[PDB]
Swiss-Prot record, chain A:
Changing residue 405 to L: No effect on RT p66/p51 heterodimerization. It comes from Human immunodeficiency virus type 1 group M subtype B (isolate BH10) (HIV-1). Changing residue 539 to D: Severely reduced exonuclease activity of RNase H, but no effect on endonucleonuclease activity. This is Reverse transcriptase/ribonuclease H. It catalyses: Endohydrolysis of RNA in RNA/DNA hybrids. Three different cleavage modes: 1. sequence-specific internal cleavage of RNA. Human immunodeficiency virus type 1 and Moloney murine leukemia virus enzymes prefer to cleave the RNA strand one nucleotide away from the RNA-DNA junction. 2. RNA 5'-end directed cleavage 13-19 nucleotides from the RNA end. 3. DNA 3'-end directed cleavage 15-20 nucleotides away from the primer terminus; DNA(n) + a 2'-deoxyribonucleoside 5'-triphosphate = DNA(n+1) + diphosphate. Changing residue 156 to A: 74% loss of polymerase activity. 56% loss of RNase H activity. Changing residue 442 to K: Almost complete loss of virion production. Changing residue 257 to T: 96% loss of polymerase activity. 45% loss of RNase H activity.
Length: 549, 418
């Protein structure tokens, strides 16, 4: 009938004193409600009545509908939380259903209320002092302080989780035939034991927890499978996530949005394609921290877009550690890519999408590489290993690319899968000057003030041209010059430029750009048979006719 | 007995809190290795489990050195080392031997295991917190902190210094010409002795450490270097009998770049040969004036640069360029155009179709060279995307220290280093 636990030493941030927020007026009704609740709590040892000597205070609320029960006591620890030391991160990552191995028997227990049975560090209790105002300011308010982890306090989640882990350690270690996982408030217990035996282990686990004064809600009778674990519906052979309905309203509060983004973040590793535009509002919304009403705009488009994706259910299989992980990727267009990770064909563990990183100039090979890295890291998180890739790029194209690219790059074990559209190199510059090919010496210049400029070329075969330009810069004209040489030359051409800027764009080997001019150059290079781009320092005895532009 | 190894008070730099660096994802094989290593260290009292009231964290992973086959725990204390006060009197107390770079041969030994014999300031312990993550986040990470001097922490060699000197004193008094330098968990032993004699000496020194232990597992290893035969890579101009327009334009470009380093360089005469509009593949005879200028320039380049000496108060910067065909060039400097060393790497283990493994190896070689020459690691400017590098470098890392780095973008400086 006795019960013991160890407390975690807690401290306020260095240089800070406890909270001293004054208690505001409360109606006679709410006061009587609070007095009752507190009497009950004090009877269970959750709180203790203190004297007038404690200088700390945190305001208390009273709310709720009589439906479920009478009133509910709510203590706002905002100030104490700001003064409380930081704790180790409880989160850090969310378990993915496809990371689970198949188990014959599974049970999920709810330990969401057990935190209120964990004792609070004795020397920290005095900082949780609160006061219940008296009937009509005629008597000193009743003073209380917590003896257990408070509902909204900063250290409750982390202290509770570490306490639970310590209690479960001996049970798990002495029952290696069962697997125990704890996410926030759900306790997953799975095994390959016959149902009779599995139920026996569950009973023993609950009695084990009971020795520390930690109870688990009564038998929530229902048909299984499916087994519900942190939003996933677990079946013996597959798992499922039911469609996620997002709230429909025309007015949003900071709190509404935080819960929405929290739900989307969770669904992000489950569903392909999500959003982060509403975050911008949150950084400025929760920036003020105020739980007011942020006017939603444009986040409207992603919300309507997330809503559509979440309209569908997600199905997948479990992981078989005795088989290889395979990841296959497909180019969809517009810088979007899709991928499926599986072990057996058509039995996906995880499917998703990858959007290209924002940038001025890009290339399909660079994007495929990024997608591979992203998928690699995610796979290591979930399965602890890198999958074998099936990529829509020829082994020969890859070789040409990485051997010539100025940066170091690499892709892990992979095989070519012929699935259009295939990724390729659209153009390839020459390493040496082309014999017999006309040589174009190009140059450009603009007037900063007038914004007027010229771009032209002179060639070894006497060909020459100058074109006027308006509303341009030096860099603009440098690129126009190269573009002109490409337009007026044959299939093979040597181009000499003094533009380090242009050379820098082209050496990046873009096959697509946001800049109209660069895209035009790209289209031209694609049509050429051979192009050699040579650089020379400007303002010297080179080129010959740079006086024309 | 009856007297412990009283700890040394250690503190963070004024106004700085401990490190809070996120643990990066680990393969199941590394997690498994870390679990077994930490379980053993915990039993030996080297580390202890900690509660959530410790908010600090420093990343950890594991490396499998070459020819060892045994996983070695590696903690990335880069953030904590920056926040740890320099112990001047004892830390910085490790002066760098300017003569180690002039030795015929240098052997590197992993001596970090010795640090575990010394307790760590109880009030500092919390800042050494680390986490062994679990696959799929299925269980909360296992958290520990050190109770003894950790390997990889700059403060470890600083505090152990006195003990190290007492352990080696007999060896040095017998070998007054052997330069021994301690950097992090490594010990550099340089001598001009005969190879066979060098190797026997390392072994004699090896015994002292083992003999000491009245208060493994990689001590037996040894990495051999040869800083005597290390030689910078000077700037050279081509020697030809023909010379095309393209050759001359490349030459003028290179000389122009060099004129930023050597003030006397001139390209006026050579440039005059490029006045006109000729085909790039056309051969142009060198005027006598150009021939002369090229000769003058070629001479200027044989001499060292003027005004270059190492400034200990400044960071060392390393730039690396991929030259292709498994070859890599690099320069180390503190101020632009004032190189302290330039080098070139060819072949190299990993050229076996893996660019990132080659770069990772080049980074390690450059760092060790830097430790020997100046006693500190350089800040690297890497020719690679952040995402590629961060995904793969730990797969090929074999050193027990880790330098700082940042990422670069397409410089024509590559051609000039050919
Ligand atoms: Mg279901
Ligand atoms: Mg997915
Ligand atoms: Mg120009
Ligand atoms: Mg860690």
């Amino acid at each position: 009938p006795i019960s013991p636990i160890e407390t975690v030493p807690v401290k306020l941030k260095p240089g800070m004193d406890g909270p001293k927020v004054k208690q505001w007026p409360l109606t006679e009704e709410k006061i009587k409600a609070l007095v009752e609740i507190c009497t009950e709590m004090e009877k269970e040892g959750k709180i203790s009545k203190i004297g007038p000597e404690n200088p700390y205070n945190t305001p208390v609320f009273a709310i709720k509908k009589k439906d479920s029960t009478k009133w509910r006591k709510l203590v706002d620890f905002r100030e104490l939380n700001k003064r409380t030391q930081d704790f180790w991160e409880v989160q850090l990552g969310i378990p993915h259903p496809a990371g689970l191995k198949k188990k014959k028997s599974v049970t999920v227990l709810d330990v969401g209320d057990a935190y209120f049975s964990v004792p609070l560090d004795e020397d920290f209790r005095k900082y949780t002092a609160f006061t219940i105002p008296s009937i009509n300011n005629e008597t000193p308010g009743i003073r209380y302080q917590y003896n257990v982890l408070p509902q909204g306090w900063k250290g409750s989640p982390a202290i509770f989780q570490s306490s639970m882990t310590k209690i479960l350690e001996p049970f798990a270690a002495q029952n290696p035939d069962i697997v125990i996982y704890q996410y926030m408030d759900d306790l997953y217990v799975g095994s390959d034991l016959e149902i009779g035996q599995h139920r026996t282990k569950i009973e023993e686990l609950r009695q084990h927890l009971l020795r520390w004064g930690l109870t688990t809600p009564d038998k929530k009778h229902q048909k299984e499978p499916p087994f519900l674990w942190m939003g996933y519906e677990l079946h013996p052979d597959k798992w499922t996530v039911q469609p996620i309905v997002l709230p429909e309203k025309d007015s949003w509060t900071v709190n509404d949005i935080q819960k929405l983004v929290g739900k989307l973040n969770w669904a992000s590793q489950i569903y392909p394609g999500i959003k982060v535009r509403q975050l911008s509002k949150l950084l400025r919304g929760t920036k003020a921290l105020t739980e007011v009403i942020p006017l939603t705009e444009e986040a409207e488009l992603e919300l309507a877009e997330n809503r559509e994706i979440l309209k569908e259910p997600v199905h997948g299989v479990y992981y078989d550690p005795s088989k290889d992980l395979i990841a296959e990727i497909q180019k969809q267009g517009q810088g979007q890519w899709t991928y499926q990770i599986y072990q057996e064909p058509f039995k996906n563990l995880k499917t998703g999408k990858y959007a290209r990183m924002r940038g001025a100039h890009t290339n399909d090979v660079k994007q495929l590489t990024e997608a591979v890295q992203k998928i690699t890291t995610e796979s290591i998180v979930i399965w602890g290993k890198t999958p074998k890739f099936k990529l829509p790029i020829q082994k020969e194209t890859w070789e040409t690319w990485w051997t010539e690219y100025w940066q170091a790059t690499w892709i892990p074990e992979w095989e070519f899968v012929n699935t259009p559209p295939l990724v390729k190199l659209w153009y390839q510059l020459e390493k040496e000057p082309i014999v017999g090919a006309e040589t174009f010496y190009v140059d450009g210049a603009a007037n900063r003030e007038t914004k007027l400029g010229k771009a032209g070329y002179v060639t070894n075969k006497g060909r020459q041209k100058v074109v006027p330009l308006t509303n341009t810069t030096n860099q603009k004209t440098e690129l126009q010059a190269i573009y002109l040489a490409l337009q007026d030359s044959g299939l093979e051409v040597n181009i000499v430029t003094d533009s380090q800027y242009a050379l820098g764009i082209i050496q990046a080997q873009p096959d697509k750009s946001e800049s109209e001019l660069v895209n035009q150059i790209i289209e031209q290079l694609i049509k050429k048979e051979k192009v050699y781009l040579a650089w020379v320092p400007a303002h010297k005895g080179i080129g010959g006719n740079e006086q024309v532009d | 007995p009856i007297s412990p190894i009283e700890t040394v008070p250690v503190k963070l730099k004024p106004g700085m809190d401990g490190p809070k660096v996120k643990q990066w994802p680990l393969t199941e094989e590394k997690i498994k290795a870390l679990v077994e290593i930490c379980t053993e260290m915990e039993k030996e009292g080297k580390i202890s489990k900690i509660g959530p009231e410790n908010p600090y964290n420093t990343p950890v992973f594991a490396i499998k050195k070459k020819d060892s086959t045994k996983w070695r725990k590696l903690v990335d204390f880069r953030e904590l080392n920056k926040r740890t006060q320099d112990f001047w009197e004892v830390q910085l107390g490790i002066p760098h031997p300017a003569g180690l770079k002039k030795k015929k041969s240098v052997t590197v030994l992993d001596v970090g295991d010795a640090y575990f014999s010394v307790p760590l300031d109880e009030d500092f312990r919390k800042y050494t917190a680390f986490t062994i993550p679990s696959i799929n986040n299925e269980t909360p990470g296992i958290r520990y902190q050190y109770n003894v001097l950790p390997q990889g922490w700059k403060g470890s060699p600083a505090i152990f210094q006195s003990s190290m000197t007492k352990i080696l004193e007999p060896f040095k008094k017998q070998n007054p010409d052997i330069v021994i330098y301690q950097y992090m968990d490594d010990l550099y032993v340089g001598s001009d002795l005969e190879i066979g004699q060098h190797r026997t000496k390392i072994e004699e020194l090896r015994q002292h450490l083992l003999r000491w232990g009245l208060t493994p597992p990689f001590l037996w290893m040894g990495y051999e270097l040869h800083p005597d035969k290390w030689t910078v890579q000077p700037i050279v101009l081509p020697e030809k009998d023909s010379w095309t327009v393209n050759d001359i334009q490349k030459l003028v470009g290179k000389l122009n770049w060099a004129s930023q380093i050597y003030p006397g360089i001139k390209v006026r005469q050579l440039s005059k040969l490029l006045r006109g509009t000729k085909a790039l593949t056309e051969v142009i005879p060198l005027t006598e004036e150009a021939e002369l200028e090229l000769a003058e320039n070629r001479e200027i380049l044989k001499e060292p640069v003027h005004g270059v000496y190492y400034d200990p108060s400044k960071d060392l910067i390393a730039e690396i360029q991929k030259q292709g065909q498994g070859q890599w060039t690099y320069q180390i400097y503190q101020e632009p155009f004032k190189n302290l060393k330039t080098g070139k790497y060819a072949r190299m283990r990993g050229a076996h179709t893996n660019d990132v493994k080659q770069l990772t190896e080049a980074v390690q070689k450059i760092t060790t060279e830097s430790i020997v020459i100046w006693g500190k690691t350089p800040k690297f400017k890497l020719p690679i995307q952040k995402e590629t590098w961060e995904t793969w470098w730990t797969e090929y890392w074999q050193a027990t220290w880790i330098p700082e780095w940042e990422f670069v973008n397409t410089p024509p400086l590559v051609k000039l280093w050919y």
